[PDB]
C-alpha cells in the first residue's frame, strides 16, 4: 500500500512531491486523473516556465536511460514539448523503477509560469497517453509494486492538511456509509454516466443523462456553457467588473442543495461546497466550459465535487467507487 501526501494549495490545486533519478531529484507535480502522462521540466528546456521551476538534470542521474522518442501534450490550460527517458521515480514510499517519463524542452505559455508545480502525473487510462507512454500507476502494477489494482484519492478543504493519494488501497477512515460503485462508460478518462443534476426536485441540467469525468486536475465543477448559465442563474451568479462569477456571500445559508444522480444514487452538494469563498468575496463553484467528445458536450467533476466524496479508481473492475468523506 503506497501513501502519497498532497499539499492543498488554496483549495484550487493539489500537488505532491516525487523524486526522480539517482540521487533523487525532487519535483512537485499535480496528480491528474484527467491526464495519463508524467513529465517534469528539464535542463533542455529554455522556456520561461522552466527557468521558473526545478529542471531535471539527466547528467546527475546514474539510473537514467535515454530514449529516441519525441513527446508533445496539449492541456486545457497549456502545452508542452519534450523527449522521453527511463529512470527511477519515487511515488509515495515506492521505488517506481524503469518508469518512462518526459523531459520538457519547451513549456510555452503564461499559465505554466505562475503555476506552483513543476510538472504533472497522469492517473488515467493508457488509452489517452501521448506517445503510448506507459503511465505511472500502470507501471507500478505490471511490476507488482502495489497489492491491488486500484487507488483512492482524498482532498482536504479550507486549505487544510490531510489530502492523500493511496496507491493500491482503500482506507475506511476517510469515508462514512458504503462505497457505491459506478461503471466506467468509456476507458480513456475516468468517464461516467450522469443521470441528472437536480435542485429542489426539478431537473436543472443533464436531463436525460450525460457524460462526465472525475478530474482531480480541475478546480471547479465544469459543464457546457449553455447548461451552466441556467445553474448560475438559479444560485444567483453574476458577471461583475472583473469577468468573474460572484454571488452575495450571505446567500449561502439561503441557497439549496444541488444534487447529482450517478448510477441511480443521489450525491448532493452543499451550498458550502459548490460555493468557494474567503473572508471577503464568494465565488460560484461552477464554470461553463464546452468539451466536445464523440459522445457529446462533456461534464467535469472537479475538485469542488471530489472534496465532498472519497473516490476510488478501480483499474481491475474499471469502476469508480464513491462515498461521502469523513
Amino acid at each position: 500500500i503506497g501513501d502519497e501526501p498532497l499539499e492543498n494549495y488554496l483549495d484550487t490545486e493539489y500537488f505532491g512531491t516525487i523524486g526522480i533519478g539517482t540521487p533523487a531529484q525532487d519535483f512537485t507535480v499535480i496528480f491528474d486523473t484527467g491526464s495519463s502522462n508524467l513529465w517534469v521540466p528539464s535542463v533542455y528546456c529554455s522556456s520561461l516556465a522552466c527557468s521558473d521551476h526545478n529542471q531535471f538534470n539527466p547528467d546527475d542521474s546514474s539510473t537514467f536511460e535515454a530514449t529516441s522518442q519525441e513527446l508533445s501534450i496539449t492541456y486545457g490550460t497549456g502545452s508542452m514539448t519534450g523527449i522521453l527517458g527511463y529512470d527511477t521515480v519515487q511515488v509515495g514510499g515506492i521505488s517506481d523503477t524503469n518508469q518512462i517519463f518526459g523531459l520538457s524542452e519547451t513549456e510555452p505559455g503564461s499559465f505554466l509560469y505562475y503555476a506552483p508545480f513543476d510538472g504533472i502525473l497522469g492517473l488515467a487510462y493508457p488509452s489517452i497517453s501521448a506517445s503510448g507512454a506507459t503511465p505511472v500507476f500502470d507501471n507500478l502494477w505490471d511490476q507488482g509494486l502495489v497489492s491491488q489494482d486500484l487507488f483512492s484519492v482524498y482532498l482536504s478543504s479550507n486549505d487544510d492538511s490531510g489530502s492523500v493519494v493511496l496507491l493500491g488501497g482503500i482506507d475506511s477512515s476517510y469515508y462514512t456509509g458504503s462505497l457505491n460503485w459506478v461503471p466506467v462508460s468509456v476507458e480513456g478518462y475516468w468517464q461516467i454516466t450522469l443521470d441528472s443534476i437536480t435542485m429542489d426536485g426539478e431537473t436543472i441540467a443533464c436531463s436525460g443523462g450525460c457524460q462526465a469525468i472525475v478530474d482531480t486536475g480541475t478546480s471547479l465543477l465544469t459543464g457546457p456553457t449553455s447548461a451552466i448559465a441556467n445553474i448560475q442563474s438559479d444560485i444567483g451568479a453574476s458577471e461583475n467588473s472583473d469577468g468573474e462569477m460572484v454571488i452575495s456571500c450571505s446567500s449561502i445559508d439561503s441557497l439549496p442543495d444541488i444534487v447529482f444522480t450517478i448510477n441511480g444514487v443521489q450525491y448532493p452538494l452543499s451550498p458550502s461546497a459548490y460555493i468557494l469563498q474567503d473572508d471577503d468575496s464568494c465565488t460560484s463553484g461552477f464554470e461553463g466550459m464546452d468539451v466536445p467528445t464523440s459522445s457529446g458536450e462533456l461534464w467535469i467533476l472537479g475538485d469542488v465535487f471530489i472534496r465532498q466524496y472519497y473516490t476510488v479508481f478501480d483499474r481491475a473492475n474499471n469502476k469508480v467507487g464513491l462515498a461521502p468523506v469523513a
Side-chain angles (χ1 to χ4, degrees), residues 273-295:
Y274 68 67
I275 290 181
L276 282 67
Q277 76 170 303
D278 310 64
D279 235 1
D280 292 58
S281 295
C282 298
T283 315
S284 170
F286 298 84
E287 176 184 300
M289 184 195 284
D290 308 294
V291 181
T293 307
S294 171
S295 303

Side-chain angles (χ1 to χ4, degrees), residues 193-206:
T193 293
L194 252 49
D195 293 350
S196 71
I197 294 178
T198 69
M199 160 181 238
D200 297 357
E202 63 173 57
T203 301
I204 57 177
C206 176

Side-chain angles (χ1 to χ4, degrees), residues 8 21 25 32 59 70 93 95 100 117 120 142 146 177 201 217 248 252 290 303 317 319:
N8 177 321
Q25 289 164 50
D32 193 8
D59 320 341
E70 221 62 291
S95 287
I100 183 182
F117 55 100
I120 303 171
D142 299 324
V146 283
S248 178
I252 285 187
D290 308 294
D303 292 353
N317 301 173
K319 286 167 173 174

Side-chain angles (χ1 to χ4, degrees), residues 175-183 192 262-263 265-267 309-310 312 319-324:
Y175 65 95
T176 62
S178 204
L179 278 179
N180 297 299
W181 298 92
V182 183
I192 280 183
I262 303 176
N263 189 33
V265 183
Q266 283 172 47
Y267 309 77
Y309 299 89
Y310 169 98
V312 187
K319 286 167 173 174
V320 173
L322 301 159

Side-chain angles (χ1 to χ4, degrees), residues 133-195:
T134 304
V136 187
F137 190 79
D138 281 55
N139 200 56
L140 292 180
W141 185 232
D142 299 324
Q143 285 180 291
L145 298 182
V146 283
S147 185
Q148 300 184 68
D149 205 7
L150 56 66
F151 56 89
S152 52
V153 163
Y154 171 74
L155 308 185
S156 319
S157 301
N158 314 169
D159 284 73
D160 278 2
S161 164
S163 309
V164 61
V165 173
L166 292 188
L167 308 185
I170 309 170
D171 186 347
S172 312
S173 60
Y174 290 108
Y175 65 95
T176 62
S178 204
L179 278 179
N180 297 299
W181 298 92
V182 183
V184 177
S185 44
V186 193
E187 302 189 9
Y189 288 118
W190 283 97
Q191 206 159 180
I192 280 183
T193 293
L194 252 49
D195 293 350

